[PDB]
Amino acid sequence: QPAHLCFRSFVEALKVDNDLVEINTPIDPNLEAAAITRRVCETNDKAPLFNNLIGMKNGLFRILGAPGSLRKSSADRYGRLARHLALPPTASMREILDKMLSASDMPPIPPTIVPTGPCKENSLDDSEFDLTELPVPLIHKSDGGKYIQTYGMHIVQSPDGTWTNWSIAAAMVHDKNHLTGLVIPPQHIWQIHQMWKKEGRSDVPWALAFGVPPAAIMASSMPIPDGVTEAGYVGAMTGSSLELVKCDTNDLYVPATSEIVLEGTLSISETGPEGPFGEMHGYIFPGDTHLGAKYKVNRITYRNNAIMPMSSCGRLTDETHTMIGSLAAAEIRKLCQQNDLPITDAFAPFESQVTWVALRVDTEKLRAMKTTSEGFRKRVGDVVFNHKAGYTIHRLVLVGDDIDVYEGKDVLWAFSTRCRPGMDETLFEDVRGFPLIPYMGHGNGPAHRGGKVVSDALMPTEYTTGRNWEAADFNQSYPEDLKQKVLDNWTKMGFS
Amino acid sequence: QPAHLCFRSFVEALKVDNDLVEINTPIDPNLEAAAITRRVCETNDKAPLFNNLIGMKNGLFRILGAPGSLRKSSADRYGRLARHLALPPTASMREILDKMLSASDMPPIPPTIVPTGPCKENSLDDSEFDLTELPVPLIHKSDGGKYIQTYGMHIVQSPDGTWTNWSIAAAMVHDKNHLTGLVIPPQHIWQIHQMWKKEGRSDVPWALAFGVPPAAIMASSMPIPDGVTEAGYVGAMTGSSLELVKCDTNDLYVPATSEIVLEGTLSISETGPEGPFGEMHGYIFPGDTHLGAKYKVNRITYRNNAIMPMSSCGRLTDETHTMIGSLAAAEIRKLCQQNDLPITDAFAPFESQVTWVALRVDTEKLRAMKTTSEGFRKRVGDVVFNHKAGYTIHRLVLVGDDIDVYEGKDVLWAFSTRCRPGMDETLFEDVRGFPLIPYMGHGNGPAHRGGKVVSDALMPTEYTTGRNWEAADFNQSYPEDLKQKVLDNWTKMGFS
Ligand SMILES: Cc1cc2c3c(c1C)C(C)(C)C[C@@H](O)N3c1c(nc(O)[nH]c1=O)N2C[C@H](O)[C@H](O)[C@H](O)COP(=O)(O)O
Ligand SMILES: Cc1cc2c3c(c1C)C(C)(C)C[C@@H](O)N3c1c(nc(O)[nH]c1=O)N2C[C@H](O)[C@H](O)[C@H](O)COP(=O)(O)O
Ligand SMILES: [K+]
Ligand SMILES: [K+]
Ligand SMILES: [Mn+2]
Ligand SMILES: [Mn+2]
């Protein structure tokens, strides 16, 4: 099976790329595996594969850390991500996001049911497993539980059967046969859970699949539209129907090659303690106490020599930056274009801790609109901040065509030099806010509302007659014939 | 003479450091010298010394570019700057700024008059020079003149004789015996020129000295207080009285070892075209047209084999970032402390194009103040934005003690995650603004007023009971004994 369609094949691909380190000596799931992975993420090192995890019971489990994190070189920086998608390892961010958006103008390709797969190689019933006995990691020293679920896919279906959602949401072990985790608006797991709670008759049939097809985990992390079944979007994106097996204890379908599958229910009534958890913005608030949703596990199925992927999330750079930020930005790009806004590109700068998105504007199109900053900012903010794709994003930065939004230094430059604080900005207080950002949930204002801004880093003539400056830089302040001479004589003269 | 007291000795020091490239083949002052220097600044390369400048007349002149720019290594990043000040080349930014502030609590050491010096080796009178015939650089392709003055020191004295100011302000060649340049509030050259215009009797006696003692050019770039003679501050800072010679045609005093000295007058009446000029924020607006102050040159004196320093300013990183930003930040630190604000450190992040200053707060002291964000922001902004040291700075970012303000990634992290847009900020519209920032002078609002903000990236408990988080990073989310094990086994395991 190809790497984008089978996690096991993805792990080989990383080895083959010289992008893996296999660690075959004993590693402790209490902090050590996550500390090594954290270090990898902070230094853009090779992904760690922990083949010898202290406490591995019943063949459960090895760990792969940093599955979607960065490589050190600029040339293949996003190569781990490209390997999720059958793209060359030198793919740009633009190319990766275009690939993730491509299925939005394609018919879905529904999945294919197969009678078995590797995820059925082993099983443990209700009398045989105990989640507290597995080598579930403690990821951060102050976490309130062992977060088994950082890179698996929750599978839930609407009561009417018409929408099956795949998404990533964190969850931790509660007891031998339950998890807890947050199920919060506007996320699709929450929208579906609300449908089941309004029906009132039963708990939500649920599965959590770990080590799924890489292309599937990418869609799981992207805010594709309400009502759209991820499996058919991934099928369209990859050009092939995904192979799924039925769960044993319910009628959901999981990827055939899933490394580990939990089957059970997500309660419509019960809650239990969750968190705190070290999170994407780089923080943990030890001691925070809160009741989350409760999941019951009835069955585990798994591959021989099963591998659990793990995100050791926090400060730059990990999956919560490379996937959450970038994939939101992609969806925001499309959303703006669909609302007739002249946006060509969008990216969530890592330097903003993926709380900003920079929107590159086609300024020829802007000029033909014959509008002003105050009107354009309001239009863009109304579109994005009232949509689920904007949920995680608190600052939008509008930039003209000279700025590469995929380059954080250029976004910073434009923001700092082209957007007058206050006057060039519109604040949005009556929109949903993201409580996870410390200034929101642990800040001075409402945790769930407001705190958003559109910052216009378009210059005045960009709305009227066109750009009226040149950069004071090597590229723009010197003619081509001189630049080339300089470059051709650089090492001759003594420079590096 | 030591490198910090003699420019010629500074150039040797750079060679000796392996921080110079001597270029002995012909280089064109029309763009080529500045293009090479621009490239150096954008890549943190060695300083270029152009020993063979096309059009060098009467021994005038060689050029040193990038005199105060960065080195490539992290270990001696600020070494060029350290060489201005007798500091080790590994000095930190903190150490450099402390050195620049040290004289603020010392008696001045007045200069010593000597009868001659190297700056008298050669002379050209009013019938012998022509500024349009010298190899003055064109620094950026769209500049409105050849900016002879980018790293010399203007010398002007109050009418009463009691204050002699040394400062850097750009100036360009107007004609064979005049320069033009901006003389604008609140700068000390402008405050002095206003005193002479109010007296109304004569033009301002003036000198411009190029290739001055490095410690002197540093003070020339720092906003030390009104009325304080830079020469006595530099004397105190260095521990020695600076040696000065009298000008021939007026009674001002110039450093004895100056490479090139212009003597003349700054008019109280006449103006002439100036600019446009590629500037510190990374822009030029070609065609901008404006009348600047006019300077008459009556005499040139110079060293044998005179060297003109040149700043090829623009996008990161050059003297306009390393000196203007950092030295303003230093003065702002002191100003805050003198106003009983608990600020321990200040720095202008390069990533903000030195338009922000990050202020590190002693949060134990803050807690004892028993105040709130809204009150503290207003207090800090009132102190800084109503003072000349705040002129160039449009955003202040308050951060707690865990943030290293000299590290732009950490400042960005704190700003993005701890300051709620709008609610955690106070806008200041009734303060002097810096028109040079594009969003000011080429923006949507008043060019000279407003556009400033204090952004509070202190978390709520930092005002009350203390920090209530830990970072989700390698340093803070793992115990010391584990961290050390990881580090000790890193290369063993296969990582880099
Ligand atoms: C890639 C990735 C995504 C997410 C998460 C993680 C990773 C690695 C964790 C490490 C587990 C940290 C966590 O905060 N986390 C997370 C989460 N969304 C949540 O509701 N809850 C979460 O706990 N997303 C984001 C969501 O996956 C996306 O917002 C997606 O759009 C949701 O799908 P849908 O609702 O649009 O179908
Ligand atoms: C280091 C340095 C400082 C300055 C400048 C440059 C360099 C290299 C130029 C390359 C020439 C670019 C230019 O914009 N420039 C510049 C300038 N101040 C001005 O009023 N005008 C200027 O044209 N400063 C800043 C001032 O030197 C400081 O603000 C100083 O504080 C002034 O001294 P004082 O008035 O406080 O005595
Ligand atoms: K999804
Ligand atoms: K000065
Ligand atoms: Mn969905
Ligand atoms: Mn001064």
Residue numbers in the entry:
A (entry chain A), B (entry chain A): 4 to 499
What text comes from the article?
The UbiD superfamily is composed of a wide variety of (de)carboxylases acting on aromatic, hetero-aromatic, and unsaturated aliphatic acids. Prenylated FMN consists of an FMN molecule modified by the addition of a fourth non-aromatic ring joined via N5–C1′ and C6–C3′ linkages between the flavin and prenyl moieties. Following binding of prFMNreduced and formation of holo-UbiD, the cofactor undergoes oxidation to form the catalytically relevant oxidized prFMN species. In the UbiD enzyme family, Arg173, Glu277, and Glu282 (A. niger Fdc1 numbering) form a conserved ionic network.
The UV-visible spectra of one of the purified Arg173 variants, R173A, exhibits a modest 550-nm spectral feature that has previously been associated with the prFMNradical form of the cofactor. ESI-MS experiments using the R173A variant were able to detect MH+ cofactor masses of 525.16 and 526.16 Da, corresponding to the mature prFMNiminium and prFMNradical forms of the cofactor, respectively. In addition, a 541.16-Da species was also observed, which we attribute to prFMNiminium having undergone subsequent hydroxylation and further oxidation. The 1.19 Å crystal structure of R173A co-expressed with UbiX was obtained, revealing clear additional density on the prFMN C1′, confirming that hydroxylation readily occurred at that position. This suggests that the oxidative maturation of the cofactor did complete (before hydroxylation), albeit over long time scales. In addition, there is a minor movement of residues 184–187, resulting in Leu185 moving away from the active site. These results, combined with the low levels of decarboxylase activity detectable by HPLC, and the small proportion of H/D exchange observed on styrene in the presence of R173A confirm that cofactor maturation can occur in the R173A variant. Crystal structures of the R173A variant do contain a hydroxyl adduct on the prFMN C1′, whereas a mass corresponding to prFMNiminium can also be detected for R173A, along with low levels of decarboxylase activity and H/D exchange. This indicates that oxidative maturation is affected in R173A, but can still occur.
